[PDB]
Amino acid sequence: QQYMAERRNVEEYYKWPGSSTGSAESASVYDHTVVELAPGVYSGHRGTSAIESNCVDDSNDGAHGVVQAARLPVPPPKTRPPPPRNPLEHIKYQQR
Amino acid sequence: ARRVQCPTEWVHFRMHTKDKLKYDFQDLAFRKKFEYSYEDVVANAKDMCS
Amino acid sequence: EEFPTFMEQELPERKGLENFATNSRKRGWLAQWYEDESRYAHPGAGRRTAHYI
Amino acid sequence: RNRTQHVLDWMNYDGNLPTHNS
Amino acid sequence: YDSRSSGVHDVAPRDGVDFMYEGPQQVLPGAHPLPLFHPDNSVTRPPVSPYLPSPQRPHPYFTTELPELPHFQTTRPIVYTVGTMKQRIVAPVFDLANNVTHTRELDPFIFGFYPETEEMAKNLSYWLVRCQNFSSKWDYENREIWRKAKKNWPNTGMGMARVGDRKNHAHPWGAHSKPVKPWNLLMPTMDVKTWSKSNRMLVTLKMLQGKLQIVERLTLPEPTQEAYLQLCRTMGWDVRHKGGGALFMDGGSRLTPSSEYDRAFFFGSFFNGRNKLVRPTLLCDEPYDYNRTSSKARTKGPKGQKNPIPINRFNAYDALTHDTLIITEGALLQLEDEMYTHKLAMLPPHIRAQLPERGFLDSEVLGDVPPALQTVQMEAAARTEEAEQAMYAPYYDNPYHPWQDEGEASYAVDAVEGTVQRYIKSRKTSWAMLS
Amino acid sequence: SASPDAPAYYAVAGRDSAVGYAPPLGPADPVDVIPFFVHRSSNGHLPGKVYSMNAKTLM
Amino acid sequence: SGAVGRGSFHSVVAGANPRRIPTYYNSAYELIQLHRAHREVTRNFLVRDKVFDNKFPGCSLANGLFKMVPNKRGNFHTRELTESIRHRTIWGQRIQQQRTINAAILEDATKVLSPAQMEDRFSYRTPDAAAYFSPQEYTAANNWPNYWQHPTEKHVVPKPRWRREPELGGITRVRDAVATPIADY
Amino acid sequence: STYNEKSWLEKARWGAFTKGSRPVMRQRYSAAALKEALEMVPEGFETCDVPRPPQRIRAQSEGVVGRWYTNYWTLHSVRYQCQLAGVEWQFGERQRPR
Amino acid sequence: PKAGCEEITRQGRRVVLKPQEYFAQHRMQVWQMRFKEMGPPFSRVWVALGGKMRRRRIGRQIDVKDMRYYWRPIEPQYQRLYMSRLRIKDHSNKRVQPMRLRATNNDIGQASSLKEWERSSDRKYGAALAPPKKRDFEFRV
Amino acid sequence: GFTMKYKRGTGLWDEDHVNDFDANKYLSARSTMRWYYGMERLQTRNNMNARRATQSYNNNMGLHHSGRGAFERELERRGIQVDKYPLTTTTGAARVAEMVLLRRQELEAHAKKAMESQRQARRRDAPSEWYDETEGPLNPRFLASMQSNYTQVITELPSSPVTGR
Ligand SMILES: NC(=O)c1ccc[n+]([C@@H]2O[C@H](COP(=O)([O-])OP(=O)(O)OC[C@H]3O[C@@H](n4cnc5c(N)ncnc54)[C@H](O)[C@@H]3O)[C@@H](O)[C@H]2O)c1
């Protein structure tokens, strides 16, 4: 069971072509969603069309500025803070 | 002997409600079927990742 | 959008075939088939059995 | 009785959810 | 009337507040030549608007783009339908720290729909009815009384009342004949056609009244309530019971729109005061009444629609009891998105045919435009579909290439029993249905 | 009318109407400004509707 | 079934359809019901993936499961969702087909007389469209709902000679001398 | 009978009972999950023999199980997913006798 | 304690939602066969046939044995009586028209054109007035 | 009877398609916590109710608690996928919506920095010509919120309508 419930977990962490993961194929179409970071700013905000900015130099094929965020690294899960160090604040924080 | 040992007007709670399904009713043996607890309904439905 | 493949369609009621489905006056969709294939009896039928399959 | 008009066009439509190029 | 012509007044001024009337120049507290039952000036319930609502100004907001601030055009292109204001709107959105960042232009269909009282009444009269505790309106019925069903003394010859079986509604132990039961109380059916109008003519009213405020993000540093009063203190909102409250339509940030409220704010929005976190929408599904005639003879229920608008949508009551309205842009993205196809379907045809020319029907399903911005909850569903369209490759029920043989398919009626059996390359494929 | 041109007659969809539909012809004369505007319905025709007093009694 | 121009199989009778490629159609209403239909299939996937986020600790004990029984979600995906994709696909074709024609029309037409008049021959610019799209340009009618503020009728509302009052707290206060109202008969 | 398995309301609603406009096989198998079902259809079998049970019999396909090909509803439902899957139905079709 | 202080503590029968009637009850069949209602909107004659057209013919007048053949209107004093049972469908709603005698083709579907029936494939688009259903050749009871 | 059971979960939120006539005009502080906790309860109270039934009835029929008979156990032992359409599992949705949030957040900081490019490209140290009030008096509250975007004071309005300077 820890296999079937795992052999099938890995197929949804990466084996999407792209759906919020899918590091294999290419950018999903919703990566290129027209987001307007500011009037006249669309994906880089550093120059003009940062994806198309590096398309001017030889980096047309090897530079990608859209956040194909399947590739993104996921932050570590946040957990409950350590208990307080003073009994007054130690038990009151257990009264929140 | 397979019967339930009380006049079934006392155990009519089982026969009209939706306990018609959750109960063995073979020859009036109004005995509960098997029923998972809530620690298991989620143990069996999360391990499937459903 | 609920029938993914062509689930065969039965011909309409006999009353409909009389008046619309096979009647060229309405250009019913069987006015081509009726004259082509149906209105001819079996190649063995005589005069009495012109209507048996 | 075959379907002469628009005989093609069943296999040429609805590029499902156009991919990264479009 | 006009009785009690004496003794109603004391002939003495209370040595504190009481005061003579000095002269015509005396500006009396509360006085005003209009009959106002809520006499509020701009210091008690001050409007959060660039200008005070004046008869001259068609609306107390930036009618034009002011040069010193980033302007963000609407999420969707804009058209001016029947009732809309035919006047451009620009509402400046507020940073959380009370600063005013970029100004944003509103949709003239949602926030430009001019009010007309008798079409928000259909909204209010619905709420003042849907918000009863119907199940409380029970009442005993004649039969439900449990008394003798037999005349103890048959009235024959003496002067006793012509009464027996006294369990009727005349006697102090009785009950009605036609009593009020919940299943006899009508919950009114409310169409989306008029709920939308009855919401748009208010959220415009809250704009024409200049009580409309846009916030970048309704998020707190921490989920404690104290952080939500501290936030209100910087933003100046008055969630006190008496000072007019605030109506938060929490939709999330400008780039991360979301329907399910920011968990931080939701837990922090539980203050005892006057505030009501409503859902970021104006539509609600078609009404339906499965127990239309009498089908279910045991339902407790009211009569009428069995799908009432929930308590936390944007209604008329809590729109007029709460002075200020607080919308995050993450809601504006949802309101323009959910009403776009509605705004377009209402234009007259000689206009509707001009849209694809002017860039209104760019349909991201065909790929003529890269997909517009979506709610995180909906983009997370959009990405689900894009990942699944490959599970439909080998089969024939593939919902993206419906009936892909209909080209080469040849049909042939069969004269033995009425059918039309399709053939594909002489091979029969028509699925003869099961009964 | 509906511009079927010489190149084997390609017409343009909403250009001719035998039923009588057509876009609004426009203002009366340029100098004047009409003070009311009657929109069209979602289906094209005009806002006049003839209800009846007391349909219940078929008056 | 029909639902597209291919003709339903009821062209059993070999009813041809000649005089084709005849109409340029902008697919106005169909692109509308596409954006409406594309919203449904996404508004359906949102439902098919609803998964418990119980912001309360009372009934938190299901916070991992989907919000629909496995057998039902396995149905609703197939009953309503996959239906709505077909219904979305249908419009995704009735338009991708009609465009193919327009792509052919807009070439054979562009040539004959003008590449300038062309997108005028294929236009729908009613003289009043300035009423609906850019109402700042429209003058020839008075289509405001608050008509008494149309520039040609702004002269109705009175321009009160107002003023502030620091002694009252910065309250604005009109300096109009109230006219003594009518009283008796 | 002091206990009735089903109230007359559901002795008299054939819609929950009959196979009419109602699918009676819940699970939809994949491509290879069918080529591995038909592997157990025995040689000598023919669909022209397993008949339609009468109305008074419930319409229930308990799924692909041992001797599923005799369950008239399991057979003609599998026979239908082999269409949507493209598997080649070797065995014969319902021969409507005359 | 208040309604009767002892009649409401000891419990009798509790009443529940009362089932409705066949809400095309009053188009009874002694009109669905005798009369037929003709007419444009706001004038509906319930034309009926002749009174004496089957009983005694021999010897009656020659030119009155045929006044029995015309679709005469019934005098309005009865039009309003019979069409009174049809108005009651939603009274006090001054803008709903009376029920019609025969079922017009668009209202029959109006029942199944409701947002709750959209999922009943059967009984929709007309299945009763449809031709009799066709079943498997093996269909059997 | 028939009560639109195909609509219970098919709403966009938790409070929809649940007929609750028991409402009120003003639901107070803890009557709102009681309400929101209520909708989800009878949304999870219903589910795990309906899961315990299906899992127990399936277990009593001798087959796996999710209906998987001997076949669909034997196929998975072989690796042949037994379900035609594997709807995305909990791992999917909780991930297919994990990056989208990881994407927006990296776009906010991508855009938080972006607007400063344009905000600091707003030289106006004095208010523009919207600062007119010939139409109607300005709003003192708002100016205090627009004082940040300038250097000269804004809130100080005379008793007279603004001249413009
Ligand atoms: N009036 C009707 O009967 C009606 C109405 C709507 C839809 N349908 C269509 O009927 C089809 C089933 O055929 P039937 O009408 O002879 O009854 P049926 O459902 O009994 O068909 C046999 C079996 O085919 C399977 N099946 C159906 N659709 C499938 C799909 N898309 N992918 C894989 N397996 C599938 C199901 O197990 C079904 O029980 C369904 O696909 C459904 O959409 C029929």
Q: Are E144 and I23 an interchain contact pair (Cβ–Cβ within 8 Å)?
A: no
Query: How much distance in Å is there from the Cα of E400 to the middle of ligand 1?
Result: 18
Nearest-angstrom CA–CA distance, G38 and G91: 9
Q: List ligand 1's pocket residues with C-beta within 6 A.
A: C 2-4; E 397, 433-434; H 21, 23-25, 28, 77, 80-81, 84; I 121; J 84
Neighbours of G7 (CB within 10 A): 15
Provide φ and ψ at J136, rounded to 5°. Answer: -175, 150
C-alpha torsion sign, points B8, B12, B14, B18: positive
I18 DSSP 8-state letter: P
Nearest-angstrom CA–CA distance, E377 and J96: 10
Nearest-angstrom CA–CA distance, J75 and J89: 20
Q: Which residues of G touch H26 (CB under 8 A)?
A: 71, 74
Residue G85, token pair as written in the block: 């994709």
Which of G46, G49, G76, G80 is the best mutation test for J, with the most CBs of J within 10 A? G49
Q: Are I138 and H20 an interchain contact pair (Cβ–Cβ within 8 Å)?
A: no
Q: Which of E150, E170, E323 is nearest to E247 (CA)?
A: E323
Helix (H) or strand (E) holding J146: helix J140-146
C-alpha torsion sign, points C25, C28, C33, C38: negative
I118 DSSP 8-state letter: T
Question: A27 in contact with J at a CB cutoff of 8 Å?
Answer: no
Out of G36, G39, G135, closest to residue E86 by CB = G135
Radius of gyration of chain E (CA): 31
Which of C6, C29, C36 is the best mutation test for G, with the most CBs of G within 10 A? C29
Q: Which of E305, E307, A90, H23 is nearest to J17 (CA)?
A: E307
C27 DSSP 8-state letter: T
> Tokens 């008496």 belong to which residue?
E242
Nearest-angstrom CA–CA distance, C35 and J91: 62
> Tokens 């209370």 belong to which residue?
E14
Q: Are J97 and A39 an interchain contact pair (Cβ–Cβ within 8 Å)?
A: no
* Residues making up the binding site of E for NAD(+): 397, 431, 434
Query: How much distance in Å is there from the Cα of H77 to the middle of ligand 1?
Result: 8
Q: Are E99 and J149 an interchain contact pair (Cβ–Cβ within 8 Å)?
A: yes
Question: D7 in contact with E at a CB cutoff of 8 Å?
Answer: yes
3-class state of residue D2 by DSSP:
strand
Out of A19, A35, A38, closest to residue E386 by CB = A19
Give the minimum alpha-carbon distance from F41 to chain E in angstroms, rounded to a whole number: 6
Scanning every residue of chain B, which has its alpha carbon at the shortest distance from the alpha carbon of H5? Answer: B20
> Tokens 């507290």 belong to which residue?
E29
> Tokens 């995906």 belong to which residue?
G77
Q: Which of E265, E318, E272, E226 is nearest to J30 (CA)?
A: E272
Residue E261, token pair as written in the block: 């409220």
C-alpha torsion sign, points I98, I101, I104, I109: positive
Nearest-angstrom CA–CA distance, H74 and H64: 7
Nearest-angstrom CA–CA distance, E117 and E198: 10
Half-sphere exposure for G47 (CA within 13 Å, toward CB):
27
Nearest-angstrom CA–CA distance, E17 and E28: 13
Q: What is the DSSP string of H27-40?
A: ----SHHHHTTGGG
Q: Which of E104, G137, E65, E207 is nearest to J129 (CA)?
A: E65
Q: Which of E273, E278, E277 is nearest to E229 (CA)?
A: E273
DSSP β-ladder status, E324-328 and E303-304: unpaired
Question: Ligand 1 pocket test: which of H71, H72, H79, H80 has the largest number of ligand atoms within 8 Å of its C-beta?
Answer: H80
- Using H for helix, E for strand and C for coil, what is the string for I40-92? CCCCCEEEECCCCCCCCCCCCCCCCCCCCCCCECCCHHHHHHHCHHHHHHHCC
Q: Which residues of H touch G78 (CB under 8 A)?
A: 28
3-class state of residue I36 by DSSP:
strand
Q: What's the gap between Cα I12 and its chain centre?
A: 39
Residue G84 contacts residue G40 (beta carbons within 8 Å):
yes
**Residues of chain A by 3-state class (helix, strand, coil), percent to 5:** 30, 0, 70
Provide φ and ψ at J54, rounded to 5°. Answer: -65, -40
Out of J48, J60, J91, closest to residue B34 by CB = J60
- Using H for helix, E for strand and C for coil, what is the string for E144-183? HHCCCCCCCCCCCCCCCCCCCCCCCCCCCCCCECCCCCHH
Q: Which residues of C touch H86 (CB under 8 A)?
A: none
Q: Which of E312, E305, E261, E258 is nearest to E286 (CA)?
A: E305
Which of A11, A34, A49, A51 is the best mutation test for E, with the most CBs of E within 10 A? A34
Residue J120, token pair as written in the block: 């600091």
Residue G52 contacts residue G64 (beta carbons within 8 Å):
yes
Neighbours of H30 (CB within 10 A): 21
Residue C2 contacts residue G80 (beta carbons within 8 Å):
no
Q: Which residues of D touch A71 (CB under 8 A)?
A: none
Query: How much distance in Å is there from the Cα of J84 to the middle of ligand 1?
Result: 14
Residue J133, token pair as written in the block: 């009030």
Residue E336 contacts residue G117 (beta carbons within 8 Å):
no
Residues 6 or more apart from E412 whose CB is under 8 A from it? D1, E420, E421, E422, E423
Q: Are I141 and H55 an interchain contact pair (Cβ–Cβ within 8 Å)?
A: yes
Provide φ and ψ at A41, rounded to 5°. Answer: -135, 130
- Cβ-defined contacts of J150-156 (< 8 Å, 24+): J150/J124, J150/J125, J150/J126, J151/J125, J151/J126, J152/J125, J152/J126, J152/J127, J154/J127
Q: What is the DSSP string of B4-19?
A: -SS-TTTTTHHHHSGG
Q: Are J95 and A4 an interchain contact pair (Cβ–Cβ within 8 Å)?
A: no
Question: A10 in contact with B at a CB cutoff of 8 Å?
Answer: no
Query: How much distance in Å is there from the Cα of H2 to the middle of ligand 1?
Result: 39
C36 DSSP 8-state letter: I
Residue E374 contacts residue A33 (beta carbons within 8 Å):
yes
Q: Which of A41, J102, A65, A68 is nearest to E256 (CA)?
A: J102
Provide φ and ψ at E413, rounded to 5°. Answer: -60, 155
H40 annotated to a ligand binding site: no
Q: Which residues of B touch J66 (CB under 8 A)?
A: 44, 48, 50
Q: What's the gap between Cα G150 and its chain centre?
A: 26
Half-sphere exposure for H12 (CA within 13 Å, toward CB):
3
Nearest-angstrom CA–CA distance, E338 and E285: 12
Angle C1-C4-C6 from CA coordinates, rounded to 5°: 110
Among protein residues, the one whose CA lies closest to atom 1 of ligand 1: H21
I42: left (phi over 0), alpha (psi -120 to 50) or beta: left
J83: left (phi over 0), alpha (psi -120 to 50) or beta: beta
Q: Which of I132, I136, H74 is nearest to E434 (CA)?
A: I136
> Tokens 């003879």 belong to which residue?
E297
Angle A45-A47-A52 from CA coordinates, rounded to 5°: 95
Query: How much distance in Å is there from the Cα of A5 to the middle of ligand 1?
Result: 30
Residue E195 contacts residue E284 (beta carbons within 8 Å):
yes
Residue I71 contacts residue I80 (beta carbons within 8 Å):
no
Scanning every residue of chain E, which has its alpha carbon at the shortest distance from the alpha carbon of J143? Answer: E50
Q: What is the largest CA-CA distance in chain I?
A: 82
DSSP β-ladder status, I45-47 and E246-249: unpaired
Question: B1 in contact with G at a CB cutoff of 8 Å?
Answer: no
Question: J67 in contact with H at a CB cutoff of 8 Å?
Answer: yes
Q: Are E429 and H84 an interchain contact pair (Cβ–Cβ within 8 Å)?
A: no
Provide φ and ψ at J156, rounded to 5°. Answer: -75, 100
DSSP β-ladder status, E427-428 and E419-424: antiparallel
Q: Which of E275, E305, E270 is nearest to E290 (CA)?
A: E305
Residues 6 or more apart from E346 whose CB is under 8 A from it? E81, E82, F42
Nearest-angstrom CA–CA distance, I78 and I83: 8
I99 DSSP 8-state letter: P
Helix count (H) and strand count (E) of chain D? 0, 0
Neighbours of G9 (CB within 10 A): 21
- Using H for helix, E for strand and C for coil, what is the string for chain G? CCCCCCCCCCCCCCCCCCCCCCEECCCHHHHHHHHHHHHHHHHHHHHHCCECCCCCCCCHHHCCCECCCHHHHHHHHHHHHHHHHHHHHHHHHHCHHHHHHHHHHHHHHHHHCCCCCHHHHCCCCCCCHHHCCCCCCCCCECCCCCHHHCHHHHHHCCCCCCCEECCCCCEECCCCCCCCCCCCC
Nearest-angstrom CA–CA distance, G121 and G115: 10
Q: Which of C44, C7, C6, C12 is nearest to C28 (CA)?
A: C12
Residue E183 contacts residue E299 (beta carbons within 8 Å):
yes
Radius of gyration of chain F (CA): 19
B27: left (phi over 0), alpha (psi -120 to 50) or beta: left
Q: Which residues of E touch H98 (CB under 8 A)?
A: 416
Nearest-angstrom CA–CA distance, E205 and E224: 33
Residues 6 or more apart from A29 whose CB is under 8 A from it? D17, D18, D19, D20, E370, E371, E386
**What count of CB pairs under 8 Å joins D to G?**
28
Query: How much distance in Å is there from the Cα of B46 to the middle of ligand 1?
Result: 30
Atom of ligand 1 nearest to the CA of H61: 39
Nearest-angstrom CA–CA distance, E429 and I105: 37
Nearest-angstrom CA–CA distance, G160 and J135: 9
Nearest-angstrom CA–CA distance, E414 and C30: 12
Residues 6 or more apart from E52 whose CB is under 8 A from it? E42, E60, E210, G172, J136, J137, J138, J139
Amino acid symbol at J156: E
3-class state of residue I111 by DSSP:
helix
Q: Are B8 and H2 an interchain contact pair (Cβ–Cβ within 8 Å)?
A: yes
Nearest-angstrom CA–CA distance, J112 and E237: 25
Residue E263, token pair as written in the block: 């968990």
Radius of gyration of chain A (CA): 22
> Tokens 């109409």 belong to which residue?
G23
Judging by beta carbons within 10 Å of its beta carbon (0-12, 13-18, 19+), is residue J120 exposed, middle or buried? exposed
Q: Are I4 and E145 an interchain contact pair (Cβ–Cβ within 8 Å)?
A: yes
Q: Which residues of A touch J106 (CB under 8 A)?
A: 67, 69, 72
Q: Are F26 and G127 an interchain contact pair (Cβ–Cβ within 8 Å)?
A: yes
- Using H for helix, E for strand and C for coil, what is the string for J16-37? CCCCCCECCCCCCHHHHHHHHH
Residue J87 contacts residue B49 (beta carbons within 8 Å):
no
Scanning every residue of chain D, which has its alpha carbon at the shortest distance from the alpha carbon of A25? Answer: D20
J135 DSSP 8-state letter: S
The CA dihedral of H3, H9, H14, H17, to the nearest 10 degrees, is -40
Out of E43, E363, E381, closest to residue G171 by CB = E43
Provide φ and ψ at A50, rounded to 5°. Answer: -55, -35
Residues 6 or more apart from J149 whose CB is under 8 A from it? E68, E69, E99, E100, J119, J122, J124
Residue F22 contacts residue G135 (beta carbons within 8 Å):
no
Q: Are D6 and G7 an interchain contact pair (Cβ–Cβ within 8 Å)?
A: yes
Residue E110 contacts residue E203 (beta carbons within 8 Å):
yes
Residue J94 contacts residue G51 (beta carbons within 8 Å):
yes
Neighbours of F54 (CB within 10 A): 9
Out of J2, J19, J108, closest to residue E256 by CB = J108
Judging by beta carbons within 10 Å of its beta carbon (0-12, 13-18, 19+), is residue I122 exposed, middle or buried? exposed
Residue F35, token pair as written in the block: 């003070």
**What count of CB pairs under 8 Å joins A to J?**
70
Question: E60 in contact with J at a CB cutoff of 8 Å?
Answer: yes
Query: How much distance in Å is there from the Cα of H23 to the middle of ligand 1?
Result: 6
Question: G46 in contact with J at a CB cutoff of 8 Å?
Answer: yes
Scanning every residue of chain E, which has its alpha carbon at the shortest distance from the alpha carbon of C52? Answer: E416
Nearest-angstrom CA–CA distance, H52 and J48: 38
Residue E322 contacts residue E275 (beta carbons within 8 Å):
yes
Residue E332 contacts residue E75 (beta carbons within 8 Å):
yes
**What count of CB pairs under 8 Å joins C to G?**
28
- Using H for helix, E for strand and C for coil, what is the string for chain E? CCCCCCCCCCCCCCCCCCCCCCCCCCCCCCCCCCCCCCCCCCCCCCCCCCECCCCCCCCCCECCCCCCCCEECCCCCCCCCCCECCCCCEEEEECCCCCEEEEECCCCCCCCECCCHHHCHHHHHHHHHHCCEHHHHCCCEHHHHCCCCCCCCCCCCCCCCCCCCCCCCCCCCCCECCCCCHHHCEECCCCHHHHHHHHHHHHCHHHHCCCEEEECCCCCCCCCHHHHHHHHHHHCCCCCCCCCCEEEECCECCCCECCCCCHHHHHHCCCCCCECCECCCCCCCCCCCCCCCCCCCCCCCCEECCCCCCCCCCCCHHHHCCCEEEEEHHHHHHHHHHHHHHHHHCCCHHHHCCHHHHCCCCCCCCCCCCCCCCCHHHHHHHHHHHHHCCCCCCCCCCCCCCCCCCCCEEEEEECCCCEEEEEECCEECCCCCCC
